[PDB]
Amino acid sequence: DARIAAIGDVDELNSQIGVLLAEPLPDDVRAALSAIQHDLFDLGGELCIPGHAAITDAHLARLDGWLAHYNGQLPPLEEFILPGGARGAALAHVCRTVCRRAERSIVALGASEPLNAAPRRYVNRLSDLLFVLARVLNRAAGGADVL
Amino acid sequence: LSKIATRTGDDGTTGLGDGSRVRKDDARIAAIGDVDELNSQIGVLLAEPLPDDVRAALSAIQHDLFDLGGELCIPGHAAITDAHLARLDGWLAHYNGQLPPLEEFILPGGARGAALAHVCRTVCRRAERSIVALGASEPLNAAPRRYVNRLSDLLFVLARVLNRAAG
Amino acid sequence: SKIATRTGDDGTTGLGDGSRVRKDDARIAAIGDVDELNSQIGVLLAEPLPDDVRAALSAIQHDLFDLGGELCIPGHAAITDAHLARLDGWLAHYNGQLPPLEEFILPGGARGAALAHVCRTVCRRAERSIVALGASEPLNAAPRRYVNRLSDLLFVLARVLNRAAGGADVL
């Protein structure tokens, strides 16, 4: 059941990003989110079929790059913030939490079955990237994060 | 010592379709909750502009999911019948017939309505997992699992229909 | 792997006392579900809402942040009778504005009302996680009693939002 559950949560995460993608977004953000949807598709395909790996260092390198890029666009967070703000920002936070949920099950799968570490490392980074994108979307809307 | 009066359920339990009391983390309660969550997500979908037939089907499905939750609330009860399953089969055939052959894989998204349909789809599959988990701890007729299994496929097809309609 | 290690890459997460637990631990699941709930409320808050309802939901977001903190920080409590009293107050406040529910309702209606019902179900989900956690770890009753009341309040608010939209509750 661990594998079935992980496959499902990743699918749920990808669907939530589809909802975020239905919102107005900066071009750079839309492109990243779109590529991520393909990544999650490969990730899901990998958790399922045994002996087949699809997530590589390059995938992790791309997330690290987007993290570095977007974080450089924002001043370090000084105070704790609450999930919300502009609709796109709020949706990004929902995606963030669903990604963390998908991470918990992926970690569960790796604990009871031979699993490559790339999957969990990918969603670990995606969780942090969605947090940052929420901030970007709040600023892009002309607002600020909810403190 | 809390000075706040207790409310039903404060002790971490909830009542079933009888005098039965169970702890909220019980497999049966999780199954009931996930079906409720799925129904709520469909409610969000119903707040979108929709083609007439799609709305009629989803509206009807909410009543079915209510009955399904009811069936799970009463261990010794059965609300979902083959008639419910049969109706989902009919909808599947009806809508699949409206759509052209699916040659390549597709990612969840598109118009907001289609995107929400995919969320309903994944939440429906999550509810199916909880219902399956319930069957591992208690005897359970198949109608519930069969219903949600069929519904997740329908939601997939409806997502495609909604994109077409939403452009 | 030629990729540098990031905090959490090993499948664990840090608690407030510096200790680290695997991410599938029951405690992390409860913290996560509370976080998910707070995020859904944030989506509801992005909708057009009556000012009193917005003020209430915004305050609740602060409570849930504190609630998550209590679950994450050992030797740290944050939810008190005051928090539970405020919820009871809002429940009495809003229920009094509505006619008695004579029949079962389906989750949905106006967009804001539908989203409130989603929050309600995610809240119940978080409650199941908090309960599972307290089943193997010493927990104050407060967190559990808080989300227990919040679930009912989100149901009530859903009805309020359907009223405000001039619509009604789906039967």
Side-chain angles (χ1 to χ4, degrees):
Chain A
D1 273 301
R3 188 171 60 99
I4 304 299
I7 291 174
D9 285 336
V10 165
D11 191 14
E12 196 175 336
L13 168 62
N14 209 1
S15 293
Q16 281 291 353
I17 291 179
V19 174
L20 172 54
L21 277 168
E23 292 290 307
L25 304 164
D27 295 326
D28 59 321
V29 173
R30 177 173 299 289
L33 292 176
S34 296
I36 289 168
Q37 283 206 297
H38 297 81
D39 288 350
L40 297 178
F41 187 75
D42 299 337
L43 194 159
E46 178 184 312
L47 297 177
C48 169
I49 305 177
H52 161 65
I55 302 303
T56 72
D57 278 347
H59 293 280
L60 308 178
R62 189 161 64 169
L63 290 187
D64 289 343
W66 284 323
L67 279 168
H69 174 60
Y70 289 110
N71 266 141
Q73 281 177 43
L74 304 165
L77 199 54
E78 67 308 300
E79 306 287 306
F80 289 121
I81 70 171
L82 301 172
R87 182 178 159 72
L91 255 19
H93 278 296
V94 170
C95 291
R96 177 183 60 74
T97 62
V98 177
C99 186
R100 280 297 185 199
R101 172 141 64 72
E103 177 180 39
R104 295 195 295 279
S105 64
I106 286 169
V107 165
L109 170 65
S112 67
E113 198 176 66
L115 190 69
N116 188 306
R120 69 170 186 275
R121 296 182 75 194
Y122 184 90
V123 296
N124 184 206
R125 284 169 180 66
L126 184 53
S127 297
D128 289 324
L129 177 55
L130 291 167
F131 177 75
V132 179
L133 289 181
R135 299 189 61 201
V136 170
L137 293 178
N138 269 321
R139 177 182 292 294
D145 299 305
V146 184
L147 301 176
Chain B
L1 218 202
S2 174
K3 76 281 291 183
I4 298 297
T6 68
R7 282 166 58 76
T8 306
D10 271 353
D11 62 16
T13 65
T14 178
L16 289 178
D18 43 27
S20 172
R21 203 72 193 170
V22 188
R23 202 168 71 184
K24 289 177 176 169
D25 59 342
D26 183 282
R28 185 172 285 278
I29 305 311
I32 289 168
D34 282 343
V35 166
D36 186 5
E37 192 177 335
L38 162 65
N39 209 3
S40 293
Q41 283 289 0
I42 287 178
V44 170
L45 175 48
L46 283 163
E48 293 290 300
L50 301 168
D52 320 305
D53 57 323
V54 175
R55 178 177 294 290
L58 293 170
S59 301
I61 288 170
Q62 286 205 296
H63 294 81
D64 291 343
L65 294 179
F66 186 80
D67 291 338
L68 196 170
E71 184 179 324
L72 299 173
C73 281
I74 303 177
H77 183 58
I80 304 299
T81 68
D82 185 60
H84 295 283
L85 303 180
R87 184 166 60 165
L88 290 182
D89 289 334
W91 285 326
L92 276 163
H94 169 66
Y95 289 109
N96 253 156
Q98 277 177 42
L99 300 171
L102 182 63
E103 213 64 56
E104 289 56 60
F105 300 109
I106 65 182
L107 304 171
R112 178 164 159 59
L116 290 172
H118 280 291
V119 168
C120 292
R121 178 184 59 77
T122 60
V123 173
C124 184
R125 283 170 61 67
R126 168 150 55 81
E128 171 166 30
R129 291 196 294 282
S130 298
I131 286 169
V132 166
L134 177 59
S137 70
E138 298 173 50
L140 188 70
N141 86 294
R145 173 182 58 72
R146 285 178 171 156
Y147 185 88
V148 299
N149 180 272
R150 282 179 175 62
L151 175 57
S152 69
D153 286 330
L154 177 51
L155 290 168
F156 180 79
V157 175
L158 289 181
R160 298 187 63 199
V161 173
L162 294 183
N163 268 306
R164 316 269 292 198
Chain C
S1 173
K2 309 78 174 180
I3 305 295
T5 292
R6 280 178 60 85
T7 304
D9 273 1
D10 71 340
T12 68
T13 182
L15 292 183
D17 68 334
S19 63
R20 301 195 67 77
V21 298
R22 202 169 63 191
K23 287 174 174 168
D24 59 341
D25 185 78
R27 184 172 292 278
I28 308 305
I31 292 174
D33 288 344
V34 170
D35 187 11
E36 192 172 339
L37 165 63
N38 206 11
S39 300
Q40 281 295 351
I41 286 172
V43 177
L44 210 213
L45 282 163
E47 291 292 303
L49 304 163
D51 294 311
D52 51 306
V53 174
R54 172 177 304 292
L57 293 173
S58 297
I60 287 171
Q61 287 210 296
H62 287 78
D63 296 342
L64 293 176
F65 183 81
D66 291 333
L67 197 154
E70 187 177 326
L71 290 177
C72 184
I73 306 173
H76 166 58
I79 307 305
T80 60
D81 289 324
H83 296 274
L84 302 180
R86 190 159 65 170
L87 292 179
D88 291 340
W90 282 321
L91 274 168
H93 178 85
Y94 288 107
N95 252 152
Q97 287 172 21
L98 304 170
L101 198 58
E102 308 268 300
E103 222 285 292
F104 298 103
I105 65 179
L106 295 178
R111 180 170 295 146
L115 288 169
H117 276 293
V118 168
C119 290
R120 174 186 62 79
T121 62
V122 178
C123 186
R124 285 298 186 194
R125 172 141 60 74
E127 173 175 37
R128 295 197 294 283
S129 286
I130 289 167
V131 168
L133 170 60
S136 62
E137 232 61 70
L139 238 54
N140 294 305
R144 191 179 73 247
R145 297 177 66 191
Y146 186 91
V147 294
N148 177 212
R149 287 168 180 62
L150 179 52
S151 295
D152 292 322
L153 181 55
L154 289 164
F155 175 82
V156 171
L157 286 179
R159 298 187 63 205
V160 172
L161 294 182
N162 266 321
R163 218 71 25 168
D169 304 309
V170 191
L171 305 181

